[PDB]
Design a protein around this motif. Structure first.
Motif, PDB file in Angstrom:
ATOM      1  N   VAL A 123       0.733  -1.351   0.032  1.00  0.00           N
ATOM      2  CA  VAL A 123       0.021  -0.122   0.368  1.00  0.00           C
ATOM      3  C   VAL A 123       0.746   1.182  -0.176  1.00  0.00           C
ATOM      4  O   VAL A 123       1.994   1.216   0.525  1.00  0.00           O
ATOM      5  N   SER A 124       0.230   2.249  -0.601  1.00  0.00           N
ATOM      6  CA  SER A 124       1.014   3.712  -0.352  1.00  0.00           C
ATOM      7  C   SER A 124       0.760   4.217   0.796  1.00  0.00           C
ATOM      8  O   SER A 124      -0.220   5.259   0.870  1.00  0.00           O
ATOM      9  N   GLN A 125       1.289   3.848   1.789  1.00  0.00           N
ATOM     10  CA  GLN A 125       0.883   4.595   3.200  1.00  0.00           C
ATOM     11  C   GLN A 125       2.316   4.673   3.849  1.00  0.00           C
ATOM     12  O   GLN A 125       3.279   3.566   3.717  1.00  0.00           O
ATOM     13  N   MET A 126       2.867   5.897   4.624  1.00  0.00           N
ATOM     14  CA  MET A 126       4.065   5.819   5.161  1.00  0.00           C
ATOM     15  C   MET A 126       4.296   4.742   6.228  1.00  0.00           C
ATOM     16  O   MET A 126       3.489   4.447   7.166  1.00  0.00           O
ATOM     17  N   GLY A 127       5.460   4.168   5.870  1.00  0.00           N
ATOM     18  CA  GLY A 127       5.933   3.195   6.961  1.00  0.00           C
ATOM     19  C   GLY A 127       5.405   1.653   6.691  1.00  0.00           C
ATOM     20  O   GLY A 127       5.929   0.595   6.936  1.00  0.00           O
ATOM     21  N   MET A 128       4.433   1.482   5.796  1.00  0.00           N
ATOM     22  CA  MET A 128       3.634   0.190   5.440  1.00  0.00           C
ATOM     23  C   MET A 128       4.468  -0.694   4.389  1.00  0.00           C
ATOM     24  O   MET A 128       3.940  -1.768   4.136  1.00  0.00           O
ATOM     25  N   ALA A 129       5.467  -0.321   3.828  1.00  0.00           N
ATOM     26  CA  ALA A 129       6.035  -1.042   2.671  1.00  0.00           C
ATOM     27  C   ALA A 129       7.451  -1.390   3.228  1.00  0.00           C
ATOM     28  O   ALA A 129       8.408  -1.770   2.103  1.00  0.00           O
ATOM     29  N   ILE A 130       7.829  -1.632   4.221  1.00  0.00           N
ATOM     30  CA  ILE A 130       9.098  -2.215   4.601  1.00  0.00           C
ATOM     31  C   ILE A 130       9.035  -3.724   4.607  1.00  0.00           C
ATOM     32  O   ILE A 130       7.879  -4.410   5.084  1.00  0.00           O
ATOM     33  N   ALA A 131       9.963  -4.659   4.100  1.00  0.00           N
ATOM     34  CA  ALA A 131       9.980  -5.863   3.960  1.00  0.00           C
ATOM     35  C   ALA A 131       9.663  -6.515   5.105  1.00  0.00           C
ATOM     36  O   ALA A 131      10.086  -6.164   6.174  1.00  0.00           O
ATOM     37  N   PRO A 132       8.633  -7.348   4.973  1.00  0.00           N
ATOM     38  CA  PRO A 132       8.135  -8.044   3.910  1.00  0.00           C
ATOM     39  C   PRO A 132       7.040  -7.637   3.332  1.00  0.00           C
ATOM     40  O   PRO A 132       6.457  -8.117   2.475  1.00  0.00           O
ATOM     41  N   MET A 158      11.874  10.354  12.755  1.00  0.00           N
ATOM     42  CA  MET A 158      12.398   8.995  13.427  1.00  0.00           C
ATOM     43  C   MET A 158      12.178   7.890  12.626  1.00  0.00           C
ATOM     44  O   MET A 158      12.753   6.872  12.508  1.00  0.00           O
ATOM     45  N   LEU A 159      11.101   7.952  11.717  1.00  0.00           N
ATOM     46  CA  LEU A 159      10.503   6.815  10.782  1.00  0.00           C
ATOM     47  C   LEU A 159      11.838   6.509   9.840  1.00  0.00           C
ATOM     48  O   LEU A 159      12.323   5.667   9.442  1.00  0.00           O
ATOM     49  N   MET A 160      12.116   7.685   9.142  1.00  0.00           N
ATOM     50  CA  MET A 160      13.124   7.968   8.135  1.00  0.00           C
ATOM     51  C   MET A 160      14.252   7.492   8.794  1.00  0.00           C
ATOM     52  O   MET A 160      15.142   6.559   8.169  1.00  0.00           O
ATOM     53  N   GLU A 161      14.716   7.934   9.968  1.00  0.00           N
ATOM     54  CA  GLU A 161      15.988   7.455  10.277  1.00  0.00           C
ATOM     55  C   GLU A 161      16.013   5.891  10.883  1.00  0.00           C
ATOM     56  O   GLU A 161      17.000   5.388  10.479  1.00  0.00           O
ATOM     57  N   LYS A 162      15.059   5.323  11.213  1.00  0.00           N
ATOM     58  CA  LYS A 162      15.099   3.765  11.516  1.00  0.00           C
ATOM     59  C   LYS A 162      15.080   3.167  10.065  1.00  0.00           C
ATOM     60  O   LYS A 162      15.950   2.185  10.142  1.00  0.00           O
ATOM     61  N   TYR A 163      14.361   3.409   9.104  1.00  0.00           N
ATOM     62  CA  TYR A 163      14.103   2.499   8.122  1.00  0.00           C
ATOM     63  C   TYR A 163      14.411   3.011   6.709  1.00  0.00           C
ATOM     64  O   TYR A 163      14.654   2.241   5.721  1.00  0.00           O
ATOM     65  N   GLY A 164      14.905   4.424   6.675  1.00  0.00           N
ATOM     66  CA  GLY A 164      15.395   4.862   5.466  1.00  0.00           C
ATOM     67  C   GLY A 164      14.371   5.247   4.633  1.00  0.00           C
ATOM     68  O   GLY A 164      13.152   5.107   4.704  1.00  0.00           O
ATOM     69  N   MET A 195       9.235   5.524   2.778  1.00  0.00           N
ATOM     70  CA  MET A 195       8.223   6.276   1.800  1.00  0.00           C
ATOM     71  C   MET A 195       7.992   5.450   0.517  1.00  0.00           C
ATOM     72  O   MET A 195       7.851   6.182  -0.632  1.00  0.00           O
ATOM     73  N   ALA A 196       8.234   3.956   0.332  1.00  0.00           N
ATOM     74  CA  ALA A 196       8.273   3.546  -0.838  1.00  0.00           C
ATOM     75  C   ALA A 196       6.796   3.277  -1.496  1.00  0.00           C
ATOM     76  O   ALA A 196       5.912   3.257  -0.401  1.00  0.00           O
TER      77      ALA A 196
END
Ligand SMILES: [Cu+2]
Ligand SMILES: [Cu+2]
Ligand SMILES: [Cu+2]
Ligand SMILES: [Cu+2]
Length: 476
Positions: free
Chosen positions: A272-281, A338-344, A348-349
Motif C-alpha cells: 500500500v501507499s502509506q508511510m511506513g507500511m512497505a517495509i519488507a516483507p 524518526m521513521l526515516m532514520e530507522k528505516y530509510g 516512503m516506498a
C-alpha cells in the motif's frame, strides 16, 4: 511443515436467560514457536463471534479479568450511547458490566474491541478484538454460503511486532503517534499464514482489517476476482467484482471467491501507499491465508441482486458539520524523521514523488479535531436525532492516512477524499478515508447519547485516536 488451519472464532448466541458471557483476560499465545502474553475475550487472544438478530434484544455480561480498566465498544452497531462502550464505558478491573443490545439494523459483519481512553491502541495490540454477525430475515433468503468455519469464514487480519524475548512490542511514542504502530508479522485470526480447506464452489470471506495503523489491499495470488457482497453496514445492492480490495483500519467487507478442485491459491495483501507500511516483507504481496480446495460441492449462491439501497435524499437545507483533523506540525515532522532514520527511504516506498519543554509540547495531546485534542468531559456538539446531516471531514494540512469513523450510525459516503466513492464503497459504511483531502458523509443517528455516554467520532489509526484525534458528540 504444514500450515496451521485457520482458527475459527466460536459463533455465540444467547442462553435461556438471554445472556452472552464475555470474559476479558490475559493468557499466553505462541507465535513462531515463542510464548507471548496476550489478551482475549473468552480465551487468550482475539474473541468469539457474537450472533445477533435484527429486532431481538440480547444481554451481554462483560467480566473484566484484567488488572487495568477497559471498555467494550461494538464497532458498527447502532445502539444508544449508554451501551456504546466508548471511553466513558469503564469496566473496573475485576468487575462486571452488563449491556442490553436492542438490535435494529440490517444484516452485517460488525466487530468489538476496547475503547479505553488513551490506551485503545495498546489494548487492541495485546489481543482484544471480537466479531459481531448480525442476521435479519432478508439475508437468509439469499442462500449465500452459510456454514460457519466451512464456506462462511471470518478473516481478521492484523500485524504485530515482537521483542527478542517473544513479547508483543507495543509503544505509543513520538514515532507511533505520528505514523502508527505497525509490525513485521502478519496474523490471520491470530495464526501466521494458515490454510483454510473450503468446498468447491463459492467461499464467503468476512474480512476485517484489525490492524492498529496498517491499511491493507486484498487480492488473490492467481488473480481470480473477489465479488464484494457487503461493506461495514451490510449488503450492497448487487455484487461488485474487483481484482483488489483496499481495506482501511476497522473496515469490513464480505466477498465471495470461487474455489475450484486441485488449485490452491492464496489470499494476499498488496503493498500500500502509506508511510511506513512497505517495509519488507510488506514491500511485496504478502500471503494472508492459503485456500485449499476440497472436492465436496459447496451449496452457496452468488445472487444477481442482494438488497435494495435507498436513494440519497436532497442535500439542500441539511446541517453541515465541519471536522478539521490536524496533527501538531512539530510532532508530525519529528515522528516522520524518526521513521526515516530507522528505516530509510523504504519508509516512503510507493508514496508520491530533545529537551523537555513542558506539557504544552506533549505528543499525548498533539493530534486534534477542530483545534482540540479529545476532551472526554466536553462533547464538541449536539447532533440531531433522526435527521440526516452532512459531515465534512478534512485532513488538509498533513498527508497521513485517517480512516475516519463515526459511532452510532451507518452512513453513506458522498465524497471520499475528493472523489465519489467506488461502487463497493457506496453503500453502508462506518469509515471513510481522509488523507490530505476532504470527505463528506451523510449520517443519521437513530439513538440517543447523553454527555455522560457520548458517541465518539475519530480517526481509527489507533495511535492518532489515543493522542487526541477524537471528539465526543451527543444525540438527542
Ligand atoms: Cu473500531
Ligand atoms: Cu465504532
Ligand atoms: Cu489519523
Ligand atoms: Cu470509536
Amino acid at each position: 511443515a504444514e500450515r496451521p488451519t485457520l482458527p475459527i472464532p466460536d459463533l455465540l448466541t444467547t442462553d435461556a436467560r438471554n445472556r452472552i458471557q464475555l470474559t476479558i483476560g490475559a493468557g499466553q499465545s505462541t507465535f513462531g514457536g515463542k510464548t507471548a502474553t496476550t489478551w482475549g475475550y473468552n480465551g487468550n487472544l482475539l474473541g468469539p463471534a457474537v450472533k445477533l438478530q435484527r429486532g431481538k434484544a440480547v444481554t451481554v455480561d462483560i467480566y473484566n479479568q484484567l488488572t487495568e480498566e477497559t471498555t467494550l465498544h461494538w464497532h458498527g452497531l447502532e445502539v444508544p450511547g449508554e451501551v456504546d462502550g466508548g471511553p466513558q464505558g469503564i469496566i473496573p478491573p475485576g468487575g462486571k458490566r452488563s449491556v442490553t443490545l436492542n438490535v435494529d439494523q440490517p444484516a452485517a459483519t460488525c466487530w468489538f474491541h476496547p475503547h479505553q481512553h488513551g490506551k485503545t491502541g495498546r489494548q487492541v495490540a495485546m489481543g482484544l478484538a471480537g466479531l459481531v454477525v448480525i442476521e435479519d430475515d432478508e439475508i437468509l433468503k439469499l442462500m449465500l454460503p452459510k456454514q460457519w468455519g466451512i464456506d462462511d469464514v471470518p478473516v481478521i487480519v492484523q500485524d504485530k511486532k515482537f521483542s527478542a524475548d517473544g513479547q508483543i512490542d507495543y509503544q505509543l511514542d513520538v514515532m507511533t503517534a505520528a505514523v502508527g504502530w505497525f509490525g513485521d508479522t502478519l496474523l490471520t485470526n491470530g495464526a501466521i499464514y494458515p490454510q483454510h480447506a473450503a468446498p468447491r464452489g463459492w467461499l464467503r470471506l468476512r474480512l476485517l482489517n484489525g490492524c492498529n495503523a496498517r491499511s491493507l489491499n486484498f487480492a488473490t495470488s492467481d488473480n481470480r476476482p473477489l465479488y464484494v457482497i457487503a461493506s461495514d453496514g451490510g449488503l450492497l445492492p448487487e455484487p461488485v467484482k474487483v481484482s483488489e480490495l483496499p481495506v482501511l483500519m476497522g473496515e469490513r467487507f464480505e466477498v465471495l471467491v470461487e474455489v475450484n478442485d486441485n488449485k490452491p491459491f492464496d489470499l494476499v495483501t498488496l503493498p500500500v501507499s502509506q508511510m511506513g507500511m512497505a517495509i519488507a516483507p510488506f514491500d511485496k504481496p504478502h500471503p494472508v491465508m492459503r485456500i485449499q480446495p476440497i472436492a465436496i460441492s459447496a451449496s452457496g449462491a452468488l445472487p444477481d441482486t442482494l438488497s435494495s439501497l435507498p436513494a440519497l435524499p436532497s442535500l439542500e437545507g441539511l446541517t453541515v458539520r465541519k471536522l478539521q483533523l490536524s496533527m501538531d506540525p512539530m510532532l508530525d515532522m519529528m515522528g516522520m524523521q524518526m521513521l526515516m532514520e530507522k528505516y530509510g527511504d523504504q519508509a516512503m516506498a510507493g508514496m508520491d514523488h530533545h529537551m523537555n519543554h513542558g506539557g504544552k509540547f506533549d505528543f499525548h495531546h498533539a493530534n486534534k479535531i477542530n483545534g482540540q485534542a479529545f476532551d472526554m468531559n466536553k462533547p464538541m456538539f449536539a447532533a440531531a436525532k433522526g435527521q440526516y446531516e452532512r459531515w465534512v471531514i478534512s485532513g488538509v494540512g498533513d498527508m497521513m492516512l485517517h480512516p475516519f469513523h463515526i459511532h452510532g450510525t451507518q452512513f453513506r459516503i458522498l465524497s471520499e477524499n475528493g472523489k465519489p466513492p467506488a461502487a463497493h464503497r457506496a453503500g453502508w459504511k462506518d469509515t471513510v478515508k481522509v488523507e490530505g483531502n476532504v470527505s463528506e458523509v451523510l449520517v443519521k443517528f437513530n439513538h440517543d447519547a447523553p454527555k455522560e455516554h457520548a458517541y465518539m467520532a475519530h480517526c481509527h489509526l489507533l495511535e492518532h485516536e489515543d493522542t487526541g484525534m477524537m471528539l465526543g458528540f451527543t444525540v438527542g
